[PDB]
Amino acid sequence: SVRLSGYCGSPWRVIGYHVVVWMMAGIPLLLFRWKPLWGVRLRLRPCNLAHAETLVIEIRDKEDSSWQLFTVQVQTEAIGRVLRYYLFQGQRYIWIETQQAFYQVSLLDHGRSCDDVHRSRHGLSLQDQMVRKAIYGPNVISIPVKSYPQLLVDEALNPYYGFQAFSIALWLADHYYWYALCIFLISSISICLSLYKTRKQSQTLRDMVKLSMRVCVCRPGGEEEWVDSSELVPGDCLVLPQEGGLMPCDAALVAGECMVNESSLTGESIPVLKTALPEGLGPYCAETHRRHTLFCGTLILQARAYVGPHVLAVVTRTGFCTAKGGLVSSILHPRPINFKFYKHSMKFVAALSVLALLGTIYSIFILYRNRVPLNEIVIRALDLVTVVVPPALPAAMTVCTLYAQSRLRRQGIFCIHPLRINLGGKLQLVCFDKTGTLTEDGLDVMGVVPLKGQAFLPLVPEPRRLPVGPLLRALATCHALSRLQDTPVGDPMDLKMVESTGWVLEGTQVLAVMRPPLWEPPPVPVSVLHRFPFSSALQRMSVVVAWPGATQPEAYVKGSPELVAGLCNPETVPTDFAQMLQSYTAAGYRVVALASKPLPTVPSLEAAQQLTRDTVEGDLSLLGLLVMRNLLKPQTTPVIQALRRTRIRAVMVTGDNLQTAVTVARGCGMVAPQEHLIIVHATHPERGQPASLEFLPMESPSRHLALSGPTFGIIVKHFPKLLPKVLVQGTVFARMAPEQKTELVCELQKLQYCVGMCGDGANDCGALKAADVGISLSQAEASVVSPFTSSMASIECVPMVIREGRCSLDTSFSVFKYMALYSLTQFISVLILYTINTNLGDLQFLAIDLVITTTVAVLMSRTGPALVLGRVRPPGALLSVPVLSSLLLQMVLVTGVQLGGYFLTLAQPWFVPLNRTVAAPDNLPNYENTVVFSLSSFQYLILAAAVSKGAPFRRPLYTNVPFLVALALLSSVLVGLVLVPGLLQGPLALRNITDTGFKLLLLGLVTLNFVGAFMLESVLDQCLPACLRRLRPKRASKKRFKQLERELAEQPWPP
Ligand SMILES: *[C@@H]1O[C@H](CO)[C@@H](O[C@@H]2O[C@H](CO)[C@@H](O)[C@H](O)[C@H]2NC(C)=O)[C@H](O)[C@H]1NC(C)=O
Ligand code: BEF
Ligand SMILES: [Mg+2]
């Protein structure tokens, strides 16, 4: 369905439109452009696809008419005859000239036969390499880093900077130099900050998504160790490192076995066994099989070759085509951030432009009736447009976020993109990773069972509360420990077990001498007669152990429960061993087994110690079992309950097993004991029968759902109507692929849920960018992509960023309300003066613009977040009855007092009118200017104090002493100005008033409007929402998640 079109034109015609916009640089274009789509469509000069140096791709969703617009450069390269390559949306769409056909990177994706992959065990020197490299492109992730000119162009293409620049020109023209310099300086430094941040962001990501590992190849001639880095071709075969080898390219393993750490994919420290592709004739690609594939970014811990000379793999995916490349494409090209407040602030500024344009018509007529010069009419009419749309408005709202950023830093949460703190305020749902976020990134021994009798014994809770005997020794001598500088090294679970015991690790074959903690209530510090390894097939290690007791030594063994019991004799094995095994596995806890065979072998003799491995691992007694598991964290259980009390929904998005995810979720408090969990599983589609959504009730001592990654896939692909019902009710998503996690967050925010994500890192990076609020608990990798970063490795950050966000959103509303009110009060005063051939003089505008507004705007933004989180959430709607009625009624009182002041001044018998002939600036002192200025001066001070509500989301206003001190000092200067004959009246060009009565009446009008303003906010706060409930009590939200919740409450989904 993509709309792909070719392009060419006359060079003079392209230069002509370059004269129209490229000379302009676009900044006038958008100043004259609502949106570029109309311009974009045919700005470019069209042709056939071949002629096209740039190809317009307009991708349509047929169902929703989602006609997204793109324009993409044509790559021309010679293999030996030029082939046409198009780098669309990152990925390579390859055009064959002969068939006039666009083809994707899935060139051979179909017909990747299991046997065919097996056949390609050797790759040709040049004749395959060069052509394959040309067709598929190079094996590296090449993110282009944008130049400061290109960045400056697109940042400066924002319309508000263009309005600020126009504003700067009119200020410069009308001699308003001081304030203009402040506006210019604030603008310029914000642009510099923005460009630096955007470059730095790209620079670290480009650095981070790069790997320079010198590697071998399997060309039949060419097998040179470290032959190349990025030169790998998708078809090529490779030899692996024997130990500790990071995988550069996604490749199927042709022969040998491997043990690999899939940290990138599963978020697991444990290894995964990898086996050779099993020989088959069908279209048996490694992708679908998913056991015979080494995915890119993963570490090979151990490589082993037995059936051939060395381990062998064939490449499958390279560069942007690999899954890691999919994640890089996911973090790039990001979905635009859509918020109600942000659009509504722009819409309110649009309404101000209409009101300003209407204002200019009144200004132009009244100035012509006033009979001013032609030049004056253009300057003063445009000046009024700059008053109605306040040019410092963006800078004001930044001050709110700038304070919160600093507060968060002191608590230890580090924040790039300060504006995103506000998004925190509106979070309804927060997603959480399990391993490293909510569950401690490590396995700890829950306990061991003794097996004193033939039947199993009750479990021992604490290994530190040790009983001396064969179990004590079995823990001591069952170890795979290496040597570092007074430090243990090897399998972390085995390393943990040696610490659990309290033992210390320091004959001709004796290694790693084993000692007690040296506390006494017979400690018998033990030695190892022989040691036999943990082979992947074996699933077990047998360690023969000699005590200093003058007794013949016995073999003590550790392994998997199945294998250990299978090798153990059935008389020794318990009857319910399998049932206990089943209980711990199904419960999700790890099951490991300890067993022993007495050895007729002589002490200290190498010959006697040496045996056949299977001879040593022959017929054994079951010594007992060991159980280890993740322990949640200290702070996890508290926070999740507080999130539940707040009614901010909690979702577990993990890469682990479903059964494990359930038990952590139950312990965590994602699902309460009274609450009911339903397992939802759906099979793959068949020609014979459709894919069946099998819903299973899960019994246990707000009914919600549990998914697997495959099941989630089957719901999105084969049940699109039901997916909404699953997303609004699902609480635990298990075995989720790194891409699938981002698609969950994308589909959640499609339903009009605001979405946050908490992440350990490297599996969740895609989501951390994709989510509205992304908090990385790692200092590594995730930090680069994540909007926010924490140092505490805890869910504890989420409460703090919620609280700060709620406060900052409330502060941002108040600062907007004030700046809008400030705009309109100056518009009311300047209109009333303009009719009389007067205007608020220069340095009277400056005082208002700098010392009153910038002080109160930057001191009302200081208020800290409220101590307790509450069920009620801040409003999102800047275009709402509550805000608009507040602005309207406050402005009616503002207008009323100012007009009341004027007509009162006119009435008094000492009153004298002005010249009304010479210009508004030339009449420097006048009673009308003095009374308008004096009354207006206080109203800016008053409004700032009233609009700040404080308590439910922020600290109490009476706590914020500097704002009250600043208000008091500014109140003292303004009351001083009117009451005293002014030393400062000379600078501001005011007229001192003899009549104390009239001065006290003018204070009378001010003190009235203070009480009026402070009351009316309280009246609307306590009445207007209640009065709305009377008008409509059943106003259901357009938010789709709310509608689906209402629907589910009426008709419940499969009960
Ligand atoms: C407003 O100011 C103007 C300018 O000072 C006044 O007009 C001047 O009046 C004096 C007489 O004292 C003449 O010498 C000037 O020639 C006049 N100038 C102009 C430009 O006409 C005007 O009288 C003042 N308005 C009022 C009501 O007194
Ligand atoms: F490592 Be997490 F549980 F996806
Ligand atoms: Mg994890």
XYZ file of N, CA, C and O in Angstrom, residues 32-120:
356
model
N 4.449 31.383 7.389
C 3.299 31.287 6.437
C 2.730 29.853 6.280
O 1.797 29.764 5.463
N 3.116 28.829 7.076
C 2.665 27.395 6.930
C 2.080 26.907 8.271
O 2.857 26.722 9.222
N 0.754 26.694 8.313
C 0.028 25.834 9.305
C 0.730 24.464 9.419
O 1.208 24.149 10.529
N 0.786 23.702 8.315
C 1.494 22.388 8.208
C 2.054 22.189 6.795
O 1.424 22.617 5.826
N 3.203 21.483 6.607
C 3.896 21.464 5.314
C 3.354 20.490 4.248
O 3.839 20.600 3.136
N 2.365 19.635 4.572
C 1.910 18.458 3.758
C 1.540 18.922 2.337
O 2.083 18.337 1.362
N 0.756 20.006 2.253
C 0.245 20.626 0.996
C 1.434 21.069 0.131
O 1.516 20.608 -1.027
N 2.355 21.848 0.721
C 3.646 22.259 0.132
C 4.508 21.068 -0.264
O 4.880 21.010 -1.454
N 4.739 20.133 0.678
C 5.604 18.907 0.554
C 5.188 18.097 -0.688
O 6.121 17.695 -1.429
N 3.874 17.849 -0.871
C 3.274 16.947 -1.909
C 3.978 17.100 -3.268
O 4.487 16.076 -3.773
N 4.020 18.329 -3.799
C 4.522 18.663 -5.165
C 5.576 19.790 -5.168
O 5.988 20.153 -6.297
N 6.078 20.282 -4.010
C 7.329 21.111 -3.936
C 8.400 20.454 -4.818
O 8.939 21.138 -5.700
N 8.612 19.155 -4.630
C 9.608 18.369 -5.392
C 9.042 18.130 -6.800
O 7.809 17.944 -6.939
N 9.928 18.138 -7.800
C 9.591 18.107 -9.253
C 9.574 16.629 -9.658
O 10.621 15.999 -9.548
N 8.423 16.016 -10.072
C 8.302 14.558 -10.286
C 8.825 13.926 -11.601
O 9.012 14.633 -12.582
N 9.001 12.596 -11.612
C 9.591 11.788 -12.730
C 9.373 10.270 -12.537
O 8.535 9.896 -11.699
N 10.027 9.422 -13.352
C 10.113 7.953 -13.109
C 11.071 7.697 -11.935
O 11.891 8.581 -11.600
N 10.928 6.524 -11.318
C 11.673 6.039 -10.124
C 13.184 6.091 -10.421
O 13.917 6.618 -9.571
N 13.609 5.643 -11.616
C 15.015 5.668 -12.111
C 15.599 7.085 -12.001
O 16.554 7.245 -11.247
N 14.926 8.088 -12.570
C 15.419 9.497 -12.612
C 15.496 10.042 -11.178
O 16.498 10.726 -10.877
N 14.520 9.675 -10.327
C 14.423 10.066 -8.892
C 15.797 9.933 -8.218
O 16.340 8.825 -8.230
N 16.395 11.066 -7.846
C 17.522 11.145 -6.868
C 16.928 11.052 -5.444
O 17.690 10.669 -4.527
N 15.676 11.505 -5.241
C 14.875 11.376 -3.985
C 13.475 10.832 -4.324
O 12.845 11.390 -5.245
N 12.999 9.828 -3.574
C 11.717 9.091 -3.785
C 10.758 9.442 -2.644
O 11.117 9.145 -1.482
N 9.588 10.022 -2.954
C 8.494 10.254 -1.957
C 7.766 8.915 -1.754
O 7.240 8.388 -2.760
N 7.763 8.408 -0.510
C 7.000 7.217 -0.020
C 5.901 7.762 0.908
O 6.275 8.334 1.968
N 4.619 7.654 0.516
C 3.446 7.998 1.372
C 2.758 6.686 1.779
O 2.011 6.122 0.948
N 3.055 6.190 2.988
C 2.556 4.884 3.522
C 1.155 5.150 4.091
O 1.065 5.994 4.991
N 0.126 4.470 3.565
C -1.303 4.560 3.978
C -1.681 3.302 4.779
O -1.461 2.193 4.241
N -2.252 3.459 5.985
C -3.157 2.439 6.594
C -4.530 2.626 5.936
O -5.152 3.660 6.215
N -4.966 1.657 5.115
C -6.272 1.648 4.379
C -7.453 1.859 5.346
O -8.332 2.684 5.007
N -7.450 1.160 6.491
C -8.562 1.112 7.491
C -8.807 2.503 8.100
O -9.986 2.920 8.132
N -7.740 3.177 8.559
C -7.769 4.498 9.256
C -7.308 5.660 8.345
O -7.253 6.797 8.873
N -7.034 5.430 7.044
C -6.498 6.414 6.055
C -5.227 7.102 6.596
O -5.129 8.348 6.490
N -4.297 6.324 7.178
C -3.070 6.832 7.860
C -1.963 7.058 6.812
O -1.006 6.263 6.771
N -2.114 8.128 6.018
C -1.227 8.553 4.890
C -0.006 9.314 5.461
O 0.065 10.564 5.322
N 0.932 8.598 6.094
C 2.202 9.176 6.638
C 3.113 9.537 5.451
O 3.155 8.735 4.502
N 3.797 10.690 5.507
C 4.605 11.284 4.394
C 6.103 11.072 4.674
O 6.527 11.374 5.810
N 6.861 10.566 3.684
C 8.349 10.432 3.696
C 8.945 10.747 2.311
O 8.254 10.511 1.296
N 10.188 11.258 2.289
C 11.028 11.533 1.082
C 12.439 10.974 1.329
O 13.036 11.380 2.351
N 12.949 10.097 0.445
C 14.136 9.213 0.693
C 15.115 9.300 -0.492
O 14.667 9.060 -1.622
N 16.413 9.492 -0.205
C 17.526 9.634 -1.197
C 17.747 8.296 -1.928
O 17.551 7.236 -1.291
N 18.153 8.355 -3.204
C 18.489 7.189 -4.082
C 20.008 6.962 -4.005
O 20.745 7.889 -4.401
N 20.443 5.777 -3.541
C 21.873 5.342 -3.507
C 22.179 4.647 -4.846
O 21.416 3.708 -5.202
N 23.255 5.067 -5.528
C 23.765 4.516 -6.816
C 25.203 4.021 -6.597
O 26.062 4.875 -6.297
N 25.435 2.701 -6.671
C 26.754 2.030 -6.458
C 26.964 0.941 -7.524
O 25.977 0.230 -7.839
N 28.208 0.786 -8.002
C 28.633 -0.162 -9.065
C 29.239 -1.422 -8.426
O 30.303 -1.299 -7.780
N 28.597 -2.585 -8.610
C 29.062 -3.905 -8.072
C 30.332 -4.327 -8.836
O 31.295 -4.756 -8.162
N 30.345 -4.171 -10.169
C 31.524 -4.378 -11.039
C 31.424 -3.615 -12.353
O 30.834 -2.511 -12.339
N 28.274 -2.497 -13.412
C 26.900 -2.080 -13.816
C 26.115 -1.666 -12.561
O 25.886 -2.546 -11.707
N 25.686 -0.397 -12.482
C 25.182 0.268 -11.235
C 23.840 -0.371 -10.836
O 23.009 -0.601 -11.740
N 23.674 -0.670 -9.537
C 22.438 -1.217 -8.905
C 21.840 -0.135 -7.996
O 22.615 0.506 -7.253
N 20.507 0.010 -8.012
C 19.753 1.070 -7.283
C 19.346 0.537 -5.901
O 18.592 -0.465 -5.857
N 19.826 1.195 -4.831
C 19.535 0.897 -3.402
C 18.827 2.107 -2.771
O 19.344 3.235 -2.945
N 17.700 1.878 -2.073
C 16.890 2.896 -1.339
C 16.872 2.529 0.158
O 16.405 1.416 0.486
N 17.353 3.433 1.027
C 17.537 3.225 2.496
C 16.280 3.730 3.233
O 16.393 4.676 4.055
N 15.120 3.104 2.981
C 13.787 3.600 3.444
C 13.667 3.308 4.954
O 13.922 2.158 5.352
N 13.329 4.310 5.778
C 12.984 4.150 7.224
C 14.082 3.336 7.953
O 13.739 2.404 8.710
N 15.363 3.592 7.638
C 16.530 2.789 8.071
C 16.841 1.613 7.147
O 17.974 1.564 6.626
N 15.889 0.691 6.949
C 16.097 -0.642 6.299
C 16.255 -0.473 4.772
O 15.761 0.537 4.232
N 16.929 -1.419 4.098
C 17.321 -1.341 2.654
C 16.256 -2.004 1.757
O 16.186 -3.259 1.743
N 15.475 -1.187 1.027
C 14.546 -1.591 -0.071
C 15.358 -1.508 -1.379
O 15.701 -0.378 -1.792
N 15.697 -2.657 -1.980
C 16.658 -2.820 -3.119
C 15.851 -2.884 -4.428
O 15.032 -3.822 -4.561
N 16.112 -1.964 -5.372
C 15.395 -1.833 -6.674
C 16.212 -2.517 -7.777
O 17.323 -2.010 -8.061
N 15.665 -3.577 -8.393
C 16.221 -4.218 -9.627
C 15.665 -3.442 -10.836
O 14.422 -3.471 -11.041
N 16.552 -2.761 -11.584
C 16.257 -1.994 -12.836
C 15.612 -2.891 -13.907
O 14.683 -2.393 -14.576
N 16.075 -4.143 -14.058
C 15.662 -5.115 -15.121
C 14.155 -5.428 -15.034
O 13.520 -5.472 -16.110
N 13.619 -5.635 -13.823
C 12.187 -5.948 -13.537
C 11.420 -4.718 -12.999
O 10.202 -4.887 -12.756
N 12.054 -3.534 -12.848
C 11.457 -2.253 -12.348
C 10.770 -2.504 -10.986
O 9.619 -2.047 -10.790
N 11.444 -3.239 -10.086
C 10.855 -3.864 -8.873
C 11.648 -3.481 -7.614
O 12.873 -3.734 -7.604
N 10.953 -2.954 -6.590
C 11.473 -2.723 -5.211
C 11.382 -4.071 -4.474
O 10.274 -4.657 -4.502
N 12.466 -4.539 -3.833
C 12.514 -5.767 -2.983
C 13.155 -5.443 -1.628
O 14.094 -4.636 -1.605
N 12.680 -6.071 -0.544
C 13.148 -5.809 0.854
C 14.418 -6.635 1.135
O 14.856 -7.414 0.257
N 14.944 -6.517 2.357
C 16.080 -7.325 2.899
C 15.679 -8.797 3.114
O 16.573 -9.550 3.518
N 14.402 -9.187 2.966
C 13.929 -10.599 2.999
C 14.135 -11.274 1.629
O 13.199 -11.968 1.163
N 15.325 -11.121 1.038
C 15.667 -11.536 -0.355
C 15.573 -13.063 -0.431
O 14.910 -13.556 -1.336
N 16.142 -13.745 0.559
C 16.212 -15.222 0.664
C 15.514 -15.706 1.942
O 15.728 -16.893 2.291
N 14.748 -14.836 2.627
C 14.234 -15.132 3.995
C 13.401 -16.413 3.902
O 13.632 -17.316 4.702
N 12.520 -16.462 2.911
C 11.868 -17.695 2.388
C 12.891 -18.557 1.628
O 13.560 -18.026 0.729
N 12.932 -19.859 1.921
C 13.842 -20.837 1.295
C 15.194 -20.918 1.980
O 16.078 -21.616 1.428
N 15.348 -20.321 3.169
C 16.511 -20.577 4.047
C 16.466 -22.005 4.571
O 16.173 -22.177 5.751
N 16.683 -23.008 3.714
C 16.460 -24.435 4.091
C 17.483 -24.827 5.162
O 18.644 -24.418 5.018
N 17.048 -25.570 6.187
C 17.905 -26.040 7.317
C 19.136 -26.742 6.735
O 20.246 -26.394 7.132
N 18.915 -27.694 5.825
C 20.010 -28.401 5.103
C 20.815 -27.389 4.273
O 22.050 -27.482 4.316
N 20.153 -26.452 3.577
C 20.847 -25.455 2.714
C 21.792 -24.588 3.546
O 22.959 -24.458 3.109
N 21.338 -24.121 4.718
C 22.212 -23.376 5.676
C 23.364 -24.333 6.021
O 24.516 -23.867 5.921
N 23.067 -25.625 6.267
C 24.105 -26.635 6.622
C 25.151 -26.742 5.502
O 26.361 -26.667 5.850
N 24.704 -26.794 4.236
C 25.568 -26.947 3.025
C 26.596 -25.812 2.946
O 27.768 -26.128 2.661
N 26.226 -24.574 3.291
C 27.105 -23.381 3.141
C 28.122 -23.334 4.294
O 28.188 -22.303 4.992
